[PDB]
Short mmCIF file of C-alpha atoms and ligand atoms in Angstrom, two decimals:
data_model
loop_
_atom_site.label_atom_id
_atom_site.label_comp_id
_atom_site.label_asym_id
_atom_site.label_seq_id
_atom_site.Cartn_x
_atom_site.Cartn_y
_atom_site.Cartn_z
CA UNK A 15 10.08 149.72 -24.80
CA UNK A 16 13.38 149.82 -22.90
CA UNK A 17 13.70 153.45 -23.63
CA UNK A 18 14.04 155.97 -20.88
CA UNK A 19 11.67 158.91 -20.77
CA UNK A 20 14.34 161.18 -22.29
CA UNK A 21 15.09 158.54 -24.87
CA UNK A 22 11.47 158.36 -25.84
CA UNK A 23 11.26 162.16 -26.14
CA UNK A 24 14.42 162.36 -28.26
CA UNK A 25 13.17 159.53 -30.48
CA UNK A 26 9.79 161.20 -31.00
CA UNK A 27 11.46 164.55 -31.66
CA UNK A 28 13.88 162.95 -34.14
CA UNK A 29 10.98 161.23 -35.93
CA UNK A 30 9.06 164.44 -36.64
CA UNK A 31 7.90 164.82 -40.25
CA UNK A 32 8.88 167.89 -42.22
CA UNK A 33 6.80 171.02 -42.56
CA UNK A 34 5.60 171.12 -46.14
CA UNK A 35 4.74 174.06 -48.33
CA UNK A 36 1.83 174.89 -50.50
CA UNK A 37 1.69 176.81 -53.82
CA UNK A 38 2.93 180.43 -53.91
CA UNK A 44 -9.94 181.60 -54.03
CA UNK A 45 -13.04 179.60 -54.95
CA UNK A 46 -14.24 176.44 -53.24
CA UNK A 47 -12.49 174.32 -55.81
CA UNK A 48 -9.06 175.96 -55.50
CA UNK A 49 -8.95 176.09 -51.69
CA UNK A 50 -10.08 172.45 -51.39
CA UNK A 51 -7.51 171.68 -54.07
CA UNK A 52 -4.70 173.26 -52.06
CA UNK A 53 -5.73 171.70 -48.76
CA UNK A 54 -6.20 168.19 -50.19
CA UNK A 55 -2.98 168.39 -52.22
CA UNK A 56 -1.16 169.34 -49.01
CA UNK A 57 -2.87 166.59 -47.01
CA UNK A 58 -1.90 163.97 -49.59
CA UNK A 59 1.76 165.02 -49.54
CA UNK A 60 1.78 165.10 -45.73
CA UNK A 61 0.27 161.61 -45.56
CA UNK A 62 3.27 160.13 -47.33
CA UNK A 63 5.56 161.58 -44.63
CA UNK A 64 3.12 160.53 -41.91
CA UNK A 65 3.57 156.88 -42.86
CA UNK A 66 7.36 157.19 -42.41
CA UNK A 67 6.92 158.97 -39.09
CA UNK A 68 4.59 156.22 -37.88
CA UNK A 69 7.28 153.62 -38.51
CA UNK A 70 9.57 155.57 -36.13
CA UNK A 71 7.10 155.74 -33.25
CA UNK A 72 8.62 153.25 -30.79
CA UNK A 73 6.59 150.04 -30.79
CA UNK A 74 4.69 150.68 -34.04
CA UNK A 75 6.65 148.36 -36.32
CA UNK A 76 6.44 145.61 -33.69
CA UNK A 77 2.73 145.44 -34.65
CA UNK A 78 1.46 143.33 -37.55
CA UNK A 79 1.12 145.02 -40.88
CA UNK A 80 -2.69 144.61 -40.59
CA UNK A 81 -2.66 146.54 -37.33
CA UNK A 82 -0.27 149.20 -38.61
CA UNK A 83 -2.60 149.80 -41.54
CA UNK A 84 -5.64 149.89 -39.26
CA UNK A 85 -4.17 152.44 -36.86
CA UNK A 86 -3.04 154.80 -39.62
CA UNK A 87 -6.34 154.56 -41.51
CA UNK A 88 -8.16 155.41 -38.27
CA UNK A 89 -5.90 158.19 -37.07
CA UNK A 90 -4.62 160.01 -40.14
CA UNK A 91 -6.96 163.04 -40.04
CA UNK A 92 -6.60 163.42 -36.25
CA UNK A 93 -2.87 163.44 -36.83
CA UNK A 94 -3.03 166.03 -39.62
CA UNK A 95 -5.27 168.15 -37.41
CA UNK A 96 -3.19 168.08 -34.25
CA UNK A 97 -0.20 168.98 -36.43
CA UNK A 98 -2.12 171.91 -37.89
CA UNK A 99 -3.22 173.12 -34.49
CA UNK A 100 0.33 172.92 -33.14
CA UNK A 101 1.68 174.87 -36.14
CA UNK A 102 -1.02 177.47 -35.61
CA UNK A 103 -0.51 178.05 -31.92
CA UNK A 104 1.42 181.25 -32.10
CA UNK A 105 -0.96 182.61 -34.72
CA UNK A 106 -4.16 183.55 -32.86
CA UNK A 107 -7.16 183.58 -35.22
CA UNK A 108 -5.27 181.84 -38.02
CA UNK A 109 -4.53 178.36 -39.28
CA UNK A 110 -0.98 177.75 -40.51
CA UNK A 111 -1.67 174.99 -43.02
CA UNK A 112 1.77 175.75 -44.46
CA UNK A 113 4.29 178.58 -43.95
CA UNK A 114 2.98 180.07 -47.20
CA UNK A 115 -0.62 179.15 -46.49
CA UNK A 116 -1.71 180.98 -43.36
CA UNK A 117 -5.49 181.24 -43.50
CA UNK A 118 -7.57 183.62 -41.41
CA UNK A 119 -10.75 182.33 -39.82
CA UNK A 120 -13.02 183.94 -42.49
CA UNK A 121 -11.22 182.30 -45.41
CA UNK A 122 -12.89 179.12 -44.18
CA UNK A 123 -16.12 180.56 -45.58
CA UNK A 124 -14.77 179.97 -49.08
CA UNK A 125 -15.74 176.29 -48.84
CA UNK A 126 -19.22 175.09 -47.92
CA UNK A 127 -19.21 173.66 -44.40
CA UNK A 128 -15.62 174.61 -43.70
CA UNK A 129 -15.93 177.55 -41.29
CA UNK A 130 -17.43 175.35 -38.57
CA UNK A 131 -14.39 173.08 -38.75
CA UNK A 132 -12.00 176.06 -38.83
CA UNK A 133 -13.63 177.33 -35.63
CA UNK A 134 -13.08 173.98 -33.89
CA UNK A 135 -9.44 173.94 -34.94
CA UNK A 136 -8.89 177.56 -33.87
CA UNK A 137 -10.51 176.81 -30.50
CA UNK A 138 -8.10 173.90 -30.05
CA UNK A 139 -5.12 176.07 -30.96
CA UNK A 140 -6.34 178.60 -28.43
CA UNK A 141 -6.56 175.91 -25.82
CA UNK A 142 -2.97 174.79 -26.52
CA UNK A 143 -1.84 178.40 -26.27
CA UNK A 144 -3.62 178.85 -22.95
CA UNK A 145 -1.95 175.70 -21.62
CA UNK A 146 1.42 176.71 -23.06
CA UNK A 147 1.71 173.30 -24.71
CA UNK A 148 5.35 172.28 -25.15
CA UNK A 149 6.80 170.66 -28.26
CA UNK A 150 7.83 167.60 -26.25
CA UNK A 151 4.27 167.22 -24.98
CA UNK A 152 2.87 167.66 -28.48
CA UNK A 153 4.88 164.78 -29.96
CA UNK A 154 3.76 162.52 -27.09
CA UNK A 155 0.13 163.41 -27.80
CA UNK A 156 0.49 162.75 -31.51
CA UNK A 157 1.92 159.29 -30.81
CA UNK A 158 -0.89 158.57 -28.38
CA UNK A 159 -3.43 159.45 -31.09
CA UNK A 160 -1.78 157.01 -33.48
CA UNK A 161 -1.75 154.15 -30.98
CA UNK A 162 -5.09 154.84 -29.35
CA UNK A 163 -7.63 155.88 -31.87
CA UNK A 164 -8.11 152.45 -33.44
CA UNK A 165 -6.94 150.15 -30.63
CA UNK A 166 -10.31 148.82 -29.34
CA UNK A 167 -11.39 148.12 -32.93
CA UNK A 179 -3.62 144.76 -27.73
CA UNK A 180 -1.40 144.40 -24.73
CA UNK A 181 1.90 145.37 -26.32
CA UNK A 182 0.16 148.56 -27.50
CA UNK A 183 -1.22 149.26 -24.05
CA UNK A 184 2.31 148.92 -22.74
CA UNK A 185 3.63 151.40 -25.23
CA UNK A 186 0.75 153.74 -24.39
CA UNK A 187 1.65 153.51 -20.68
CA UNK A 188 5.24 154.38 -21.54
CA UNK A 189 4.13 157.52 -23.35
CA UNK A 190 2.02 158.49 -20.32
CA UNK A 191 5.15 157.97 -18.20
CA UNK A 192 7.02 160.22 -20.62
CA UNK A 193 4.43 163.02 -20.39
CA UNK A 194 4.54 162.86 -16.60
CA UNK A 195 8.38 162.90 -16.74
CA UNK A 196 8.26 166.08 -18.82
CA UNK A 197 5.94 167.73 -16.33
CA UNK A 198 8.00 166.72 -13.31
CA UNK A 199 11.07 168.10 -15.06
CA UNK A 200 9.20 171.37 -15.58
CA UNK A 201 8.70 171.62 -11.81
CA UNK A 202 5.01 170.81 -11.57
CA UNK A 203 3.73 169.37 -8.32
CA UNK A 204 2.20 165.90 -8.31
CA UNK A 205 -1.27 167.41 -8.25
CA UNK A 206 -0.38 169.72 -11.13
CA UNK A 207 1.07 166.86 -13.14
CA UNK A 208 -2.09 164.78 -12.91
CA UNK A 209 -4.31 167.77 -13.68
CA UNK A 210 -2.25 168.69 -16.73
CA UNK A 211 -2.13 165.11 -17.97
CA UNK A 212 -5.93 165.01 -17.77
CA UNK A 213 -6.27 168.39 -19.50
CA UNK A 214 -4.09 167.22 -22.40
CA UNK A 215 -5.85 163.88 -22.85
CA UNK A 216 -9.30 165.50 -22.80
CA UNK A 217 -8.26 167.57 -25.80
CA UNK A 218 -7.87 164.28 -27.67
CA UNK A 219 -11.65 163.80 -27.39
CA UNK A 220 -12.05 167.12 -29.16
CA UNK A 221 -9.51 166.17 -31.83
CA UNK A 222 -11.48 162.97 -32.46
CA UNK A 223 -14.66 164.99 -32.80
CA UNK A 224 -13.03 167.32 -35.33
CA UNK A 225 -11.67 164.37 -37.29
CA UNK A 226 -15.13 162.76 -37.41
CA UNK A 227 -16.54 166.05 -38.71
CA UNK A 228 -13.70 166.63 -41.15
CA UNK A 229 -14.15 163.12 -42.54
CA UNK A 230 -17.79 163.76 -43.32
CA UNK A 231 -16.86 167.07 -44.95
CA UNK A 232 -14.21 165.46 -47.16
CA UNK A 233 -16.66 162.74 -48.14
CA UNK A 234 -19.12 165.31 -49.19
CA UNK A 235 -16.48 167.12 -51.22
CA UNK A 236 -15.62 163.78 -52.80
CA UNK A 237 -19.21 163.12 -53.84
CA UNK A 238 -19.53 166.56 -55.46
CA UNK A 239 -16.37 166.19 -57.64
CA UNK A 240 -15.50 169.47 -56.20
CA UNK A 241 -11.90 168.42 -56.23
CA UNK A 242 -9.66 165.71 -57.60
CA UNK A 243 -8.47 163.59 -54.69
CA UNK A 244 -5.41 161.31 -54.85
CA UNK A 245 -5.74 157.50 -54.71
CA UNK A 246 -4.10 157.46 -51.28
CA UNK A 247 -6.46 160.06 -49.93
CA UNK A 248 -9.42 158.16 -51.43
CA UNK A 249 -8.24 154.97 -49.71
CA UNK A 250 -7.74 156.74 -46.38
CA UNK A 251 -11.21 158.35 -46.62
CA UNK A 252 -12.64 155.01 -47.71
CA UNK A 253 -11.51 153.27 -44.55
CA UNK A 254 -14.04 155.32 -42.63
CA UNK A 255 -17.18 154.17 -44.29
CA UNK B 2 -3.31 146.08 -51.88
CA UNK B 3 -3.81 149.58 -50.84
CA UNK B 4 -0.93 151.86 -51.22
CA UNK B 5 -0.46 151.77 -47.50
CA UNK B 6 0.25 148.25 -47.35
CA UNK B 7 3.32 148.57 -49.64
CA UNK B 8 4.57 151.84 -48.37
CA UNK B 9 4.62 150.35 -44.94
CA UNK B 10 7.44 148.11 -46.04
CA UNK B 11 9.36 150.29 -48.56
CA UNK B 12 12.65 150.57 -46.55
CA UNK C 14 -18.38 173.61 -5.51
CA UNK C 15 -14.63 174.00 -6.01
CA UNK C 16 -14.87 173.61 -2.25
CA UNK C 17 -15.78 169.95 -2.35
CA UNK C 18 -13.25 167.43 -1.19
CA UNK C 19 -12.69 164.26 -3.18
CA UNK C 20 -14.94 162.15 -0.95
CA UNK C 21 -17.67 164.83 -1.09
CA UNK C 22 -17.34 164.87 -4.90
CA UNK C 23 -17.73 161.08 -5.15
CA UNK C 24 -20.72 161.09 -2.80
CA UNK C 25 -22.41 163.92 -4.72
CA UNK C 26 -21.99 162.07 -8.02
CA UNK C 27 -23.08 158.69 -6.66
CA UNK C 28 -26.19 160.31 -5.13
CA UNK C 29 -27.04 162.03 -8.40
CA UNK C 30 -27.13 158.79 -10.40
CA UNK C 31 -30.20 158.23 -12.57
CA UNK C 32 -32.22 155.02 -12.32
CA UNK C 33 -32.00 152.11 -14.75
CA UNK C 34 -35.15 152.44 -16.86
CA UNK C 35 -37.15 149.70 -18.60
CA UNK C 36 -37.86 149.56 -22.34
CA UNK C 37 -41.24 148.97 -23.94
CA UNK C 38 -40.08 145.69 -25.43
CA UNK C 39 -42.96 143.57 -26.74
CA UNK C 40 -41.95 139.91 -26.73
CA UNK C 41 -45.13 138.84 -28.52
CA UNK C 42 -43.67 139.92 -31.89
CA UNK C 43 -40.39 139.72 -33.79
CA UNK C 44 -38.35 142.89 -34.26
CA UNK C 45 -38.41 144.99 -37.37
CA UNK C 46 -35.96 147.77 -38.10
CA UNK C 47 -38.72 150.26 -37.31
CA UNK C 48 -39.78 148.61 -34.04
CA UNK C 49 -36.22 148.21 -32.77
CA UNK C 50 -35.45 151.85 -33.54
CA UNK C 51 -38.74 152.75 -31.86
CA UNK C 52 -37.73 150.90 -28.71
CA UNK C 53 -34.27 152.41 -28.55
CA UNK C 54 -35.39 156.00 -29.17
CA UNK C 55 -38.35 155.67 -26.78
CA UNK C 56 -35.84 154.53 -24.15
CA UNK C 57 -33.39 157.32 -24.98
CA UNK C 58 -36.12 159.91 -24.67
CA UNK C 59 -37.13 158.80 -21.21
CA UNK C 60 -33.48 158.57 -20.11
CA UNK C 61 -32.90 162.10 -21.40
CA UNK C 62 -35.43 163.49 -18.93
CA UNK C 63 -33.50 161.91 -16.06
CA UNK C 64 -30.25 163.10 -17.64
CA UNK C 65 -31.38 166.72 -17.57
CA UNK C 66 -32.08 166.51 -13.87
CA UNK C 67 -28.85 164.58 -13.20
CA UNK C 68 -26.80 167.26 -14.99
CA UNK C 69 -28.23 169.87 -12.65
CA UNK C 70 -26.70 167.94 -9.76
CA UNK C 71 -23.24 167.77 -11.26
CA UNK C 72 -21.08 170.23 -9.31
CA UNK C 73 -20.79 173.51 -11.11
CA UNK C 74 -23.32 172.79 -13.87
CA UNK C 75 -26.27 174.84 -12.62
CA UNK C 76 -23.99 177.87 -12.12
CA UNK C 77 -23.63 178.07 -15.88
CA UNK C 78 -25.96 180.21 -17.98
CA UNK C 79 -28.97 178.31 -19.28
CA UNK C 80 -27.48 178.65 -22.77
CA UNK C 81 -24.25 176.96 -21.70
CA UNK C 82 -26.20 174.21 -19.91
CA UNK C 83 -28.15 173.64 -23.12
CA UNK C 84 -24.94 173.58 -25.16
CA UNK C 85 -23.16 171.05 -22.94
CA UNK C 86 -26.12 168.65 -22.91
CA UNK C 87 -26.72 169.03 -26.67
CA UNK C 88 -23.08 168.12 -27.24
CA UNK C 89 -22.74 165.28 -24.74
CA UNK C 90 -26.13 163.56 -24.54
CA UNK C 91 -25.41 160.52 -26.71
CA UNK C 92 -21.92 160.10 -25.23
CA UNK C 93 -23.58 160.05 -21.84
CA UNK C 94 -26.24 157.53 -22.91
CA UNK C 95 -23.52 155.35 -24.41
CA UNK C 96 -21.14 155.35 -21.46
CA UNK C 97 -24.13 154.45 -19.28
CA UNK C 98 -25.00 151.60 -21.64
CA UNK C 99 -21.43 150.31 -21.70
CA UNK C 100 -21.30 150.45 -17.89
CA UNK C 101 -24.62 148.54 -17.54
CA UNK C 102 -23.33 145.92 -19.94
CA UNK C 103 -20.02 145.20 -18.26
CA UNK C 104 -21.15 142.06 -16.49
CA UNK C 105 -22.91 140.77 -19.64
CA UNK C 106 -20.17 139.74 -22.11
CA UNK C 107 -21.32 139.86 -25.73
CA UNK C 108 -24.50 141.75 -24.88
CA UNK C 109 -25.74 145.32 -24.56
CA UNK C 110 -28.06 145.81 -21.61
CA UNK C 111 -30.13 148.67 -22.98
CA UNK C 112 -32.64 147.89 -20.26
CA UNK C 113 -33.19 144.96 -17.91
CA UNK C 114 -35.87 143.74 -20.34
CA UNK C 115 -33.82 144.64 -23.44
CA UNK C 116 -30.53 142.77 -23.58
CA UNK C 117 -29.32 142.62 -27.18
CA UNK C 118 -26.41 140.91 -28.95
CA UNK C 119 -24.71 141.90 -32.21
CA UNK C 120 -26.90 139.55 -34.25
CA UNK C 121 -29.98 141.42 -33.04
CA UNK C 122 -28.28 144.70 -33.93
CA UNK C 123 -28.20 143.50 -37.55
CA UNK C 124 -31.95 144.21 -37.50
CA UNK C 125 -31.27 147.87 -38.11
CA UNK C 126 -29.31 148.90 -41.14
CA UNK C 127 -25.92 150.29 -40.07
CA UNK C 128 -26.39 149.39 -36.44
CA UNK C 129 -24.26 146.29 -36.00
CA UNK C 130 -21.11 148.38 -36.57
CA UNK C 131 -22.11 150.62 -33.66
CA UNK C 132 -23.09 147.62 -31.48
CA UNK C 133 -19.63 146.16 -32.13
CA UNK C 134 -17.94 149.35 -30.95
CA UNK C 135 -20.11 149.51 -27.83
CA UNK C 136 -19.44 145.85 -27.00
CA UNK C 137 -15.69 146.39 -27.43
CA UNK C 138 -15.83 149.32 -25.02
CA UNK C 139 -17.74 147.24 -22.50
CA UNK C 140 -15.02 144.61 -22.80
CA UNK C 141 -12.41 147.27 -22.23
CA UNK C 142 -14.22 148.42 -19.08
CA UNK C 143 -14.38 144.83 -17.91
CA UNK C 144 -10.71 144.16 -18.49
CA UNK C 145 -9.80 147.38 -16.64
CA UNK C 146 -12.16 146.45 -13.81
CA UNK C 147 -13.73 149.91 -14.01
CA UNK C 148 -15.24 150.91 -10.66
CA UNK C 149 -18.59 152.61 -10.12
CA UNK C 150 -16.86 155.57 -8.51
CA UNK C 151 -14.60 155.93 -11.56
CA UNK C 152 -17.58 155.59 -13.89
CA UNK C 153 -19.51 158.49 -12.35
CA UNK C 154 -16.38 160.67 -12.55
CA UNK C 155 -15.97 159.87 -16.26
CA UNK C 156 -19.61 160.56 -17.02
CA UNK C 157 -19.41 163.99 -15.36
CA UNK C 158 -16.17 164.70 -17.23
CA UNK C 159 -17.99 164.00 -20.53
CA UNK C 160 -20.79 166.41 -19.63
CA UNK C 161 -18.41 169.25 -18.77
CA UNK C 162 -15.73 168.59 -21.41
CA UNK C 163 -17.35 167.59 -24.69
CA UNK C 164 -18.84 171.00 -25.49
CA UNK C 165 -16.37 173.20 -23.63
CA UNK C 166 -14.27 174.25 -26.67
CA UNK C 167 -17.36 175.43 -28.41
CA UNK C 168 -17.28 177.53 -25.22
CA UNK C 179 -14.66 178.56 -19.27
CA UNK C 180 -12.27 178.77 -16.39
CA UNK C 181 -14.99 177.75 -14.03
CA UNK C 182 -15.62 174.55 -15.93
CA UNK C 183 -11.91 173.86 -16.05
CA UNK C 184 -11.65 174.13 -12.30
CA UNK C 185 -14.42 171.60 -11.78
CA UNK C 186 -12.78 169.33 -14.35
CA UNK C 187 -9.51 169.60 -12.37
CA UNK C 188 -11.37 168.69 -9.21
CA UNK C 189 -12.73 165.55 -10.85
CA UNK C 190 -9.16 164.67 -11.87
CA UNK C 191 -8.09 165.07 -8.23
CA UNK C 192 -11.00 162.83 -7.29
CA UNK C 193 -10.04 160.07 -9.76
CA UNK C 194 -6.46 160.04 -8.44
CA UNK C 195 -7.78 159.99 -4.87
CA UNK C 196 -9.96 156.95 -5.68
CA UNK C 197 -7.03 155.10 -7.23
CA UNK C 198 -4.73 155.95 -4.33
CA UNK C 199 -7.37 154.83 -1.85
CA UNK C 200 -7.63 151.58 -3.84
CA UNK C 201 -3.91 150.97 -3.31
CA UNK C 202 -2.51 151.79 -6.75
CA UNK C 203 1.13 152.86 -6.86
CA UNK C 204 1.93 156.43 -7.86
CA UNK C 205 2.93 155.30 -11.36
CA UNK C 206 -0.16 153.11 -11.60
CA UNK C 207 -2.28 156.12 -10.76
CA UNK C 208 -1.18 158.23 -13.71
CA UNK C 209 -1.18 155.22 -16.05
CA UNK C 210 -4.77 154.36 -15.15
CA UNK C 211 -5.89 157.99 -15.29
CA UNK C 212 -4.62 158.07 -18.87
CA UNK C 213 -6.21 154.72 -19.79
CA UNK C 214 -9.60 155.91 -18.50
CA UNK C 215 -9.45 159.28 -20.23
CA UNK C 216 -8.39 157.79 -23.56
CA UNK C 217 -11.60 155.76 -23.58
CA UNK C 218 -13.42 159.07 -23.75
CA UNK C 219 -11.92 159.47 -27.28
CA UNK C 220 -13.63 156.25 -28.25
CA UNK C 221 -16.90 157.29 -26.66
CA UNK C 222 -16.80 160.51 -28.67
CA UNK C 223 -16.20 158.50 -31.82
CA UNK C 224 -19.14 156.21 -31.07
CA UNK C 225 -21.41 159.16 -30.37
CA UNK C 226 -20.51 160.77 -33.69
CA UNK C 227 -21.24 157.55 -35.56
CA UNK C 228 -24.44 157.07 -33.58
CA UNK C 229 -25.55 160.61 -34.35
CA UNK C 230 -25.08 160.07 -38.05
CA UNK C 231 -26.97 156.82 -37.80
CA UNK C 232 -29.89 158.39 -35.94
CA UNK C 233 -29.99 161.19 -38.51
CA UNK C 234 -30.18 158.61 -41.30
CA UNK C 235 -33.08 156.87 -39.56
CA UNK C 236 -34.92 160.17 -39.17
CA UNK C 237 -34.27 161.17 -42.77
CA UNK C 238 -35.63 157.83 -44.01
CA UNK C 239 -38.78 158.17 -41.88
CA UNK C 240 -37.93 154.91 -40.10
CA UNK C 241 -39.07 156.31 -36.73
CA UNK C 242 -40.84 159.37 -35.40
CA UNK C 243 -38.62 161.25 -32.98
CA UNK C 244 -39.74 163.29 -29.98
CA UNK C 245 -39.30 167.07 -30.08
CA UNK C 246 -36.45 166.68 -27.60
CA UNK C 247 -34.56 164.13 -29.72
CA UNK C 248 -35.25 166.13 -32.88
CA UNK C 249 -33.68 169.18 -31.28
CA UNK C 250 -30.79 167.25 -29.73
CA UNK C 251 -30.09 165.68 -33.05
CA UNK C 252 -30.45 169.10 -34.74
CA UNK C 253 -27.79 170.61 -32.54
CA UNK C 254 -25.29 168.43 -34.39
CA UNK D 2 -36.08 179.10 -27.17
CA UNK D 3 -35.24 175.44 -27.51
CA UNK D 4 -37.36 172.96 -25.66
CA UNK D 5 -34.39 172.05 -23.56
CA UNK D 6 -34.00 175.57 -22.34
CA UNK D 7 -37.39 175.32 -20.74
CA UNK D 8 -37.13 171.86 -19.62
CA UNK D 9 -33.87 172.85 -17.74
CA UNK D 10 -35.82 175.29 -15.57
CA UNK D 11 -38.36 172.79 -14.15
CA UNK D 12 -37.32 172.30 -10.63
C1 EST E 1 -10.02 167.19 -44.71
C2 EST E 1 -10.10 168.67 -45.03
C3 EST E 1 -9.07 169.01 -46.08
C4 EST E 1 -7.63 168.88 -45.57
C5 EST E 1 -7.41 169.65 -44.29
C6 EST E 1 -6.00 169.59 -43.83
C7 EST E 1 -4.90 169.58 -44.67
C8 EST E 1 -3.61 169.55 -44.19
C9 EST E 1 -3.34 169.54 -42.83
O1 EST E 1 -2.10 169.49 -42.35
C10 EST E 1 -4.42 169.55 -42.01
C11 EST E 1 -5.72 169.58 -42.41
C12 EST E 1 -6.86 169.59 -41.43
C13 EST E 1 -8.17 170.01 -42.03
C14 EST E 1 -8.44 169.23 -43.26
C15 EST E 1 -9.82 169.53 -43.83
C16 EST E 1 -11.07 169.40 -42.97
C17 EST E 1 -12.18 169.16 -43.96
C18 EST E 1 -11.51 169.09 -45.32
O2 EST E 1 -12.22 168.23 -46.18
C1 EST E 2 -28.76 156.60 -31.53
C2 EST E 2 -29.18 155.13 -31.58
C3 EST E 2 -30.52 154.96 -30.92
C4 EST E 2 -30.47 155.05 -29.40
C5 EST E 2 -29.41 154.13 -28.79
C6 EST E 2 -29.38 154.17 -27.34
C7 EST E 2 -30.52 154.24 -26.61
C8 EST E 2 -30.50 154.26 -25.25
C9 EST E 2 -29.29 154.19 -24.59
O1 EST E 2 -29.25 154.20 -23.26
C10 EST E 2 -28.12 154.12 -25.30
C11 EST E 2 -28.13 154.09 -26.64
C12 EST E 2 -26.85 154.00 -27.43
C13 EST E 2 -27.01 153.55 -28.86
C14 EST E 2 -28.07 154.44 -29.45
C15 EST E 2 -28.21 154.19 -30.91
C16 EST E 2 -26.96 154.36 -31.74
C17 EST E 2 -27.54 154.57 -33.13
C18 EST E 2 -29.06 154.63 -32.98
O2 EST E 2 -29.62 155.52 -33.90
#
């Protein structure tokens, strides 16, 4: 709002949720672990959202809408970030580092694993920075449900300013700044795609009683159909 | 109320 | 190719633009779910033929292997149909101009089960375009970005260089239009974030079309069957 | 090959 670029970055960095652990595999047990983790992460996600500058200035109705829309995108970009320095693997948790082929343990999962791994590869290629990552995650929260207004578009502009500030600080030329900004935002289209796909997969797992899902996770899934 | 709605206010 | 200046890029894309096609709308009868789906998919099929030939004129596209050309179009085709629709509809608040003889509002969308939700998203995007005062030159840049980007992380550098050139071109357009330096990066971001929404709409639309197929509501062309199958 | 693969070659 009246934050400076560095203030915005520090605030987003401070607001970061913790990295959670799993338990120290059939379809049922892997889906169990992943959905148990997701549920626990969601509780921290809600707290993080309240610390994204501008978010609590929104109505409760809007806060609910944005989180219900964005939650899987947000879990996924977190996963991809965690996984960046682990080529070919997904670091769901520090004690749950899954190779690409372990995705085959759940029907329909390997295709989603491949999309996530490709995203992690793309971040690695771009040398995505932590400060850029937290900007992107906030943009996902504020953007993904916003057409379904002006104060939010102002906050979104401020985060764009913050990304550009980071790139200028890194020594990028004007041309390089705009190109990199575009590269980063285009990855959000891919994160949306993966979330759409992941949502259908979870739904399908829900229908099959493959796995007990928490009330919270059921309500978050439910918002999408 | 969904869980979310309360949690969003819980201090 | 990478050699194009910004003005050459804009001119290439404007030249490559497909025509606005007409639908087979029959005003002698009311709609049914089947006939409305028939109209929309008949239209899509004919637009797809123009889309294939348009894609070949997008800088860098025909240099790709035929397999990669197939992949990019299979991934992006409904996004591309939708951004075209939203663009056509900008100066028609509350309506979707599928064709000059097929201008539908959300109440007509209710004629197809599950469709009004998608109509509402498309109308909202059209409103967003309107409020932003999206320019034709920006629109053709965005549409080419969708073609090259949507399938690119299903597989590289070549595509990324063309994508960077389109970014340069968008900034050039905004600068030429008198936007301040800060306004340029803010608007670039606003435009590109709408591509997230267009992806979302395409995914919902793809699931809807699949449902229609799977309920034998409408016969689909071989092309649409295979496009739909790719997903 | 897919229909599109052929259709892409018609010049
Ligand atoms: C939602 C799924 C389970 C939970 C998974 C998860 C769980 C935790 C996390 O941090 C990220 C992700 C992303 C992929 C998600 C999966 C994709 C499909 C599956 O149903
Ligand atoms: C794919 C659908 C049929 C074809 C429709 C169409 C048809 C032509 C066109 O130019 C755009 C669109 C977007 C909405 C599409 C619809 C969304 C759901 C429906 O099944």
